[PDB]
């Protein structure tokens, strides 16, 4: 049965008794009374969400013995705890409860929640929970996801999640947390702490068994140090972007001070205050694949260690203030992409990009770099490099497929500049160069598909 | 946020912390002849950012006046009132008297 968004004031009594799934979302129900609802004891999916239901009968839901999922979400149940003691009754078979958007409160939540051994996923997000005490989450031994995002949570006692030995997903996004002094959720798998005010993150020291966390989200926080993650071997994804880290523990605004990353895969140190990389910092990030470092004010980036970052598939580094860069031979061997634009490079060794065994994409826009241009490089962008003369042997043995040289006033193309690009180039753009005549034989380029010679 | 409460307790919120300086005991300087010291104090304590909703319980609306009164983006704990301090220090051979500004702090807000 689907009666959603019909504006019904009361519960309808004409529904067949054999109903297994009922939908009433978006109506004007203001109370869930026991008599209309007890007729349909065969319900397994009841949907009352997005109503104005304010009062709940104590024996309202006790008849629906075969409920598997109920959703009272986005209701006015905050005042129910005061209008009614007991609130929800025991729900012996309910598996998914969603009370989100109710403006529920800690303490009021401690009494509203009734015991449910079959609950699989509870959601309380978009509420007004300020703190989690020791006796908030009690008597849910089968919960494995708890959603709390967009709350005002500030304080969390040491053993708030003690009664949840099977919680695996914990979403604490957009909360008012400031300092994390401990972390010992052994079996937790996902932890999201984004859009918080966290100035310091410390984990537990020397646990009995390795933690199961594989997802940390510290983006858009106020961290000042790279967190100590020596006790988190299986952390795979790690956002630390949009923070204040200066590589390269204390909380100065608070005054609190009390193979580490072998299997980390996705590191994101973008938008930080990093100015230099100590050598030991990059030695730990073995088997790290995709490393982003853009919008950092770093001024020098070197990798001299043999085998360092062996499987680094991508290296995003754009929009720094670089003056120099050094790449060791047979070091970034598996490097397929390199973002380098937005910098201020002036001089480089002739084989600075040649030693990259499998480089394919290379953006070097807005840098003022003059051409040695790699059997594997595919896409190139020397846009806004203030170039004047392009020598003939620019791409003799570099089968490039895409090449951009736009916005280079005063460009003088030498004869035979596109030496070996006849069979490999596919799309070429020279917009805004202000060229007077073309010195490159276009018809000889069989594989060209699109051309841009505007302006 | 009483000054006495902030100065005679330990909380993890923006409060004025008690401090007395002695030119000889604390600063280790002796060229300032007068006075023996002053209560400079300082401001310390984080101000969390409060992510907001359209529907909130009536009693979480009091957290805004305490934590982000100005609806800033990254609130900071800063002094709100300051007082001057006169000293007497020797610069060479001529004694000098000056009324230094922004030296004594009484209360701190989140700004």
């Amino acid at each position, epitope marked *: 049965v689907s009666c959603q968004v019909l504006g019904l004031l009361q519960v309808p009594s004409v529904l067949p008794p054999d109903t297994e799934t009922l939908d009433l979302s978006g109506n004007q129900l203001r109370s869930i009374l026991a008599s209309p609802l007890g007729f349909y004891t065969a319900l397994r999916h009841l949907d009352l969400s997005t109503n104005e239901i304010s009062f709940l009968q104590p024996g309202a839901f006790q008849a629906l013995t075969h409920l598997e999922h109920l959703s009272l979400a986005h209701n006015r149940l905050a*005042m129910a*705890t*005061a209008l009614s*003691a*007991g609130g929800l009754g025991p729900l012996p078979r309910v598996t998914s409860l969603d009370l989100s958007g109710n403006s529920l*409160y*800690s*303490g*009021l939540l401690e*009494r509203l929640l009734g015991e449910a051994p079959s609950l699989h996923t509870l959601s309380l997000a978009e509420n007004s929970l*300020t*703190r989690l*005490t020791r*006796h908030t989450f009690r008597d849910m031994p089968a919960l494995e996801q708890l959603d709390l995002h967009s709350n005002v949570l500030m304080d969390i006692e040491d053993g708030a999640f003690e009664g949840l030995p099977r919680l695996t997903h914990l979403n604490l996004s957009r909360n008012s947390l400031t300092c994390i002094s401990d972390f010992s959720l052994q079996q937790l798998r996902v932890l999201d702490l984004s859009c918080n005010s966290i100035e310091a993150f410390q984990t537990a020291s020397q646990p009995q068994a390795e933690f199961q966390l594989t997802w940390l989200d510290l983006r858009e926080n106020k961290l000042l140090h790279f967190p100590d993650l020596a006790a988190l071997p299986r952390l795979i994804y790690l956002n630390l972007s949009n923070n204040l880290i200066r590589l390269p523990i204390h909380a100065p605004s608070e005054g609190w001070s009390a193979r580490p990353l072998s299997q980390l895969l996705n590191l994101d140190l973008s938008y930080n205050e990093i100015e230099l990389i100590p050598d030991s910092f990059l030695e730990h990030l073995t088997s790290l694949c995709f490393l982003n470092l853009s919008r950092n004010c770093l001024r020098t980036f070197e990798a001299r260690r043999l085998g360092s970052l062996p499987c680094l598939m991508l290296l995003d580094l754009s929009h720094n203030a670089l003056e120099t860069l050094e790449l060791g031979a047979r070091a970034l061997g598996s490097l397929r992409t390199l973002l380098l634009q937005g910098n201020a490079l002036r001089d480089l060794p002739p084989y600075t990009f040649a030693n990259l065994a499998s480089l394919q994409r290379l953006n070097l826009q807005g840098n003022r770099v003059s051409p040695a241009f790699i059997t594997s490089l595919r896409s190139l962008s020397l846009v806004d490099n203030e170039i004047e003369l392009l020598r003939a042997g620019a791409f003799l043995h570099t089968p490039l497929t895409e090449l951009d040289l736009s916005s280079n006033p005063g460009l003088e193309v030498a004869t035979g500049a596109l030496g070996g690009l006849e069979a490999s180039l596919e799309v070429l753009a020279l917009q805004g160069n202000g060229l007077m005549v073309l010195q490159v034989d276009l018809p000889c380029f069989i594989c060209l598909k699109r051309l841009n010679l505007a302006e | *946020l*009483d000054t*006495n*409460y902030c100065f*005679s*307790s330990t*909380e993890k919120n923006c409060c004025v912390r008690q401090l007395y300086i002695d030119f000889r005991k604390d600063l280790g300087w002796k060229w300032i002849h007068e006075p023996k010291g002053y209560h400079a104090n300082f401001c310390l304590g984080p101000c969390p950012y409060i992510w907001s909703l359209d529907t909130q*319980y009536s*009693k*979480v609306l*009091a*957290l805004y006046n305490q934590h982000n009164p100005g609806a800033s983006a990254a609130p900071c704990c800063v002094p709100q009132a300051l007082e001057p301090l006169p000293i007497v220090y020797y610069v060479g051979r001529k004694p000098k008297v000056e009324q230094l500004s922004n030296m004594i702090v009484r209360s701190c807000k989140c700004s």
Partner: antibody
Amino acid sequence: EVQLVQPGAELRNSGASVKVSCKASGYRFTSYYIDWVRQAPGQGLEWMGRIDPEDGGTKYAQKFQGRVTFTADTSTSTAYVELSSLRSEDTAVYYCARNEWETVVVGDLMYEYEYWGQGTQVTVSS
Amino acid sequence: DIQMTQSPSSLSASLGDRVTITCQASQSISSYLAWYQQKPGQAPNILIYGASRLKTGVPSRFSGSGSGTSFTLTISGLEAEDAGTYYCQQYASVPVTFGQGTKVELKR
């Protein structure tokens, strides 16, 4: 640690008004509730209502409807009571409690008390 | 208004004995109770939180039990410091109501 102090109320002639003070220290005054419990030597312990210093919301029991009003003053971190039209069946020790968590946590429900005052004896004898 | 009664008006016992005070509620209470330990001259002191959750810093000889309608306080070994009046409280309805008080004294 936090402690609330009340001074002994000596004696008050019948038909007058009494003032019970509950100066508090060691915590942020405008963050908690204040409860007023009365121990008459006749029967048990009776709970009058509670006040919220931050807002000023007043609630009170079924018997003290209009016969008592309590205010707060956030500048000096003190809470008060105003008992009017005294009778003989009023002499009691008036305590002062705190719900132990916060106003935010204890939204509209009721809790127990962990911090008590010392009480005042409002005695009427003429 | 949830009227509650303390079954013994007053009781006298001796050192190293087991003391019991019961509490009966007019209606259902769930687990929202509290026990107090007033001295002969001072203010009340909280003993038991919830219905059996012992506080911190108070002697563990006291134990809580029961739920809904019947609650009992049991003292393991009576001592001179456990002489006074003991109280009940419920926080499950807008009028918070206390018990009546039971005096505990010694005898030799």
